[PDB]
Paper text:
In 2018, two novel influenza-like virus genomes were detected from the lungs of amphibian-Wuhan Asiatic toad (Bufo gargarizans) and the gill samples of ray finned fish-Wuhan spiny eel (Mastacembelus aculeatus), respectively. The HA of the Asiatic toad influenza-like virus (tHA) and spiny eel influenza-like virus (eHA) share 23.0% and 42.8% amino acid sequences homology with IBV HA, respectively. It was revealed that eHA could bind to monosialic ganglioside 2 (GM2) and mediates fusogenicity under various pH conditions. The tHA and eHA resembles the typical homotrimeric conformation.
To elucidate the molecular mechanism, the cryo-EM structures of the extracellular domain of apo-tHA and apo-eHA were determined at resolutions of 2.65 Å and 2.95 Å, respectively. While the amino acid sequence of eHA is only 42.8% identity to IBV HA, the overall structure of eHA is very similar to IBV HA, with an RMSD of 3 Å. In eHA, α-helix A and α-helix B are connected by an interhelical loop, similar to canonical HA. The overall packing of eHA is slightly looser than that of IAV and IBV, but more compact than that of tHA. For the eHA, the HA2 subunit of eHA exhibits significantly more intra-subunit interactions than HA1. Consequently, the structural integrity of the eHA trimer is likely maintained predominantly by the HA2 subunit. In eHA, the base of the groove is formed by N95, W158, W191 and Y202. Although there is a noticeable cavity at the RBS of eHA, this region exhibits a slight negative charge, which repels the negative charge of SA. Additionally, compared to IBV HA, the P238 in the 240-loop corresponds to T238 in eHA, and this change causes an outward shift in the 240-loop. Furthermore, we compared the RBS of all canonical IAV and IBV strains with that of eHA and found that only the 240-loop of eHA RBS is outward shift. These factors collectively contribute to eHA’s inability to bind to canonical SA receptors.
Residue numbers in the entry:
A (entry chain C), B (entry chain A), C (entry chain B): 1 to 336, 360 to 514
Write the structure that this text describes.
């Protein structure tokens, strides 16, 4: 009869693409792409995500918390991600500031992108070092404390001096005060009122000049002294005064300069920030929601598959990455019993087949290992930069977008090439295995074997299920069927 | 006689490099590099390329079209690529503007980089909303229409008020007006003249102040009131007045502020732009020229080979990409009849050979498939970002150049590595094929063969042309030559 | 007796990782990672590195050399790398300039990053072309020459005209003057003094206005006229005047404008720079120290191994690149005499072994070739972009860091993948070799061979050391041992 080994044919259900064989029909395959479904925002499964600077604070917006307003002095917690849910934050709890006339509008979003936020316990510039020495910080008639007594902002001091008259100008210098690895943020401003008011509290009637130089540029301000826009973004009514503002940042080993004349509002406490973290644009949190990753287009999504297809957008957490077209991976053998590799005996005793389990387990193990190696591709991390904001200037934003687009395109192309290579490797390893089975088959058949050449052998005896289980198990001697075993090496 | 199979040797002509075997001489090779030849600029084979804003307009420059001058109101067509053929555009059809005193010089090049250009049907700021109620746009004695009647610009209104005196200042706010995915571009300015004139048309004799804040920064202007540079870039002679200009851009959900005093030239209609497209730096078009891709160094070039060697420069269309050094790909077999793989019989009847076509076609098919896969490398696309201009600031330009250089270097390295890998794979696949021929050879020779082991076999009979063509065709039985066929599987 | 061939087992000492086989114990391995040790700064083994602008000059700081001070006019040498050893360079040899009030502080660090530095032999704006014609450059009572005679700077001219009174304002234009591929740097300033003084030298008592426009932006200056900061950074004591400065840069085909009033200090000679080179941040040079590469974290380091593990920082020269985790490469065979591939004969004559050298040399050659190919990964170069400074603005610096980090992470991931692939390839090629030996073995045994199937063969005679050297050498005939040779191909 004829005994040989090979694979088992089956009905093909999927089609895969290689680099040399084109399209190959295979019985089974694994999908490595999916379409995410939208979901609400929530906390990451890894840690806390920040949406509001002071969740404990009530009646305070982000601008009030950033400005160190009285009755907005809560404790800021830590987080590993942030949501930018307001492109124009508002304030409601002190004297009116003309925010959309300088650059101090996007302050909370600047503080949003650091894990560690702490408030300075000192003062940016000593109060006893000014040119005109008898200076005090004037309490405001509007910004009352919790009890109701008048108070100042807390980070921006309304200054008054002993002298009342025209002044040529005074210059001051500011140095770094936070630690070595910390970012220092401060604010300073100017007071604007009617002509009669300034001549009563400052002694001048003409707009004054202020100059600020910092390791970000120069800024000249000569605020108008007269007609004002509408009164808004304040808790006090019938106010004839306005405040101009300007914020500055500093790193280790840096300094800046300020020149001013009558009507200057001095710096106070400052912010020390550290540990940059990513931020994403979306909506406010929803209670009791935990997701694997945050996507700026879909929301809270899981990661049931290493790659996904659909709209492209920023994401933070443990989520799939963009891929151009659907992909499939071979999970079986080429098409045309219990396992794939098996033996077969044909003759006048009908035809009888068996199965090998150890051999067929190795192929599945290799396929799983290759799948895991491909999966490992979506975890290139361990380098987080300071990043930039989202409403600064067109050129910077477009540069960031170009960088992200280049990265995404290159990663997608690499993924496609790797998929093709792995498909081809599996297809070839199948043939390797079927060949490797043949040498095993011929080792214990003796020298009376009459092999067909194409994997099949001829033997002069009949084989039954006992023969199949013997050759599969390994213990099979031709002698027990009556053919010569082999010559001993000992003459 | 002795019958075996193998490849047909040949004279080597080229040398190729692998990762393990060093330098290998092969009979034939395919070149994958070439040096392009320069050619004139022209239209892309895919679509239209834009060089002039209004090809139908006559007597108008790009500055006049961008400024919505009268008699320059043509239709702006669509295109997929642009050429920046003027780094300093000029104007000749209205009142003089001191362009190289602000930032409004590169206006046509700003409009050039969008596929869809459209002119607003409204007005940026309503004409009734100004603080002074009776306001009118004054026609100018210079900017005449086609007939000859006096006219205004059309995007910049000369404003005059009822009152004539010293004014503290007025502030206005500008909001987004184009659609969600459209970029809004507007311009505004101020009037400069001699001391005697302004006291008659505005009532002041001192330079005034203008302040503009936008999501690009702050801009303060106190134009001089006196000596003026020469009169140029205009169609009107003997004019004592000049105009200062400034342009601003806006996206969805954004706003800006303008504070001004006496002598302000208000905004009018604006531009809505969309669909960013790439631009390249070169010359004007030449009539009736169509090329495959546009290279900023060579011009219109074709793509006869996926890679090219030479100078590096920006390109738009379907063109090769930079490669460091020449490359070659194996297109044959190793060196030392009709096809390569074939049989041979040697004996007392001389030596007779045959050729196998089915196997020798498979190797060429695999080579072509690998070549196509490697060619597919140069089409990483499908993500175009807004990009930037060419005369903005040194740091931004150098950042763009750095990104492009890094991308090019990485692509060149990847291409070289892939070339080496494919060379080695092909050389090994040949050996695979010659081995696979041997099992085919031994299937139909029977059990009486006395194979040499090294691909050759010994049979005890002579072979003629019929023997060779029979074994190549496949139908060959030892029984017809008088040797035992095989043992039947049926006892 | 039984004769076969294979590898020699040995004691396993190292463990390596593949993509399918997991962890494999191997006899020998090669390490491709190391920890650098810090060392002093010095010159590169390739060329000269620049730390001081004029090493030959004595008594002059970098600011004085950049400002073309008298007695600081030495020759500037060439270099291939630069060290930024001062984040705040100082000056000590002329009239005081309020440096930290504009942007002219980091002038030496701007001249530092170009290989070719040359001082112009002309003048930026011809001195006989001003609005008021009788103009002169006033010598300073402070900035004396080496002899002691009064002198000017040499790059910045103190201007005085015939007229003395209020002036409306004057405008000048500056065009490119260096060659086509050269960067032009110029400086200009303004004079500040006390009120009574200017009325004696200029005829005014009020702060004046100066405006500069260049292809980098706008800059307006109205310096204060009165109380001054302390007197420092000069060689002259008891001086009541100060100078404000501003620097501008220009490329080919660019132009700029300056408007000024009374009290303007005019431009003089300028700088032409070319050939950008990289810079690193560190300390001053140490005499007689040469290293293979410069690392901004460790100092002068050598390159004993293509990859290194530890802290990440910028480097210049021929140095390794960052890698996440330690790596090892197979340098032997799988674990369980002179070489590894060898024969063995067993029988009643004990057991005897031999070694093959020609086969075992090929595996070493292949391993070394693959190692060289992997090493070649760390030489991606031949594209140097102009780069930027380190103290400009937060956004630009952060963008640079983002680009560098993206590059580093991608390179590390690629290196890891390639190491895994090469490990697998070597492990498989060993098995290839051991199989390939068997066909050679069976070629010269004759047709009476009784192969065991798994590489071993049975022969009917005894083999001695002579038999082993015969089979390894190749000359071995069964007839001289008493077996049939083969059937002759000629009937
Ligand atoms: C694989 O997933 C993609 C995307 O979800 C889908 O379009 C495709 O039909 C899926 N195919 C199979 C065989 O699962
Ligand atoms: C498909 O792959 C999975 C994952 O290894 C495996 O468990 C399963 O058996 C495969 N499919 C079939 C039909 O064997
Ligand atoms: C291949 O093309 C390059 C392109 O310049 C050329 O230098 C080289 O000589 C060519 N070689 C062959 C064999 O065609
Ligand atoms: C060279 O390659 C081309 C394209 O694959 C092929 O058509 C040609 O036959 C090859 N050369 C030879 C001599 O076969
Ligand atoms: C390989 O080098 C790394 C880098 O220092 C070291 O930690 C490791 O111990 C070394 N191992 C061997 C076997 O050389
Ligand atoms: C380790 O590799 C080197 C070169 O790669 C080789 O010279 C040496 O023989 C190898 N080690 C052993 C034990 O063979």
């Amino acid at each position: 009869d004829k005994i040989c080994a090979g694979v088992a044919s089956g009905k093909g259900t999927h089609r895969v693409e290689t680099i040399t064989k084109g399209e190959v029909l295979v019985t089974n395959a694994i999908n490595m792409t999916h379409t995410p479904t939208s979901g609400p925002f929530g906390d990451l499964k890894t840690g806390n995500v920040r949406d509001k600077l002071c969740p404990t604070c009530t009646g305070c917006t982000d601008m009030d918390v950033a400005l160190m307003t009285p009755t907005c002095n809560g404790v800021i917690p830590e987080a590993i991600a942030a949501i930018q849910h307001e492109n124009r934050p508002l304030q409601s709890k002190c004297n009116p500031i003309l925010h959309d006339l300088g650059n101090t509008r996007q302050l909370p979003n600047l503080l949003r992108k650091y894990k560690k936020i702490r408030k300075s316990s000192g003062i940016a510039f000593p109060l006893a070092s000014y040119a005109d020495q008898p200076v005090i910080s004037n309490p405001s008639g509007n910004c009352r404390d919790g009890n109701g007594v008048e108070s100042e902002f807390g980070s921006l001091l309304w200054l008054t001096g002993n002298t009342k008259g025209a002044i040529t100008g005074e210059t001051i210098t500011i140095t770094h005060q936070c630690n070595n690895d910390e970012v220092m943020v401060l604010v300073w401003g100017a007071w604007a009122d009617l002509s009669a008011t300034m001549n009563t509290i400052y002694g001048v009637t003409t707009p004054q000049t202020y100059v600020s130089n910092f390791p970000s540029g120069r800024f000249s301000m000569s605020p108008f002294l007269g007609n004002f826009p509408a009164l808004a973004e304040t808790e006090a009514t019938t106010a004839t005064g306005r405040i101009y503002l300007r914020m500055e940042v500093l790193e280790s080993g840096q300094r800046g300069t300020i020149q001013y004349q009558r009507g200057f509002m001095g710096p106070g406490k400052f912010w020390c920030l550290s540990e940059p973290i990513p931020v994403v644009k979306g909506a406010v949190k929803t209670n009791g929601a935990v997701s694997d990753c945050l996507h700026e287009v879909y929301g809270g999504i899981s990661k049931p598959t290493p790659f996904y297809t659909g709209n492209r957008g920023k994401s933070v957490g443990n989520c799939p990455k963009w891929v151009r077209k659907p992909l499939l991976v071979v999970n079986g053998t080429k098409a045309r019993i219990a396992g794939w590799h098996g033996y077969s005996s044909t003759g006048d005793h009908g035809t009888k087949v068996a199965a090998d389990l150890v051999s067929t387990q190795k192929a599945m193990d290799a396929i799983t290992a290759r799948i895991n190696n491909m999966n490992k591709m979506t975890e290139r991390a361990f380098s987080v930069t300071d990043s930039t904001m989202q409403e600064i200037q067109k050129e910077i934003k477009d540069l960031d977008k170009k960088i992200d687009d280049v990265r995404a395109d290159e990663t997608a192309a690499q993924i496609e090439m790797i998929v093709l290579l792995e498909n081809e490797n599996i297809i070839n390893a199948e043939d390797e295995h079927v060949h490797a089975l043949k040498q095993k088959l011929t080792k214990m058949l003796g020298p009376s074997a009459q092999d067909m050449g194409d994997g099949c052998f001829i033997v002069d005896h009949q084989c039954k299920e006992d023969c199949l289980r013997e050759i599969v198990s390994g213990n099979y001697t031709p002698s027990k069927y009556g053919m010569d075993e082999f010559k001993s090496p000992i003459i």
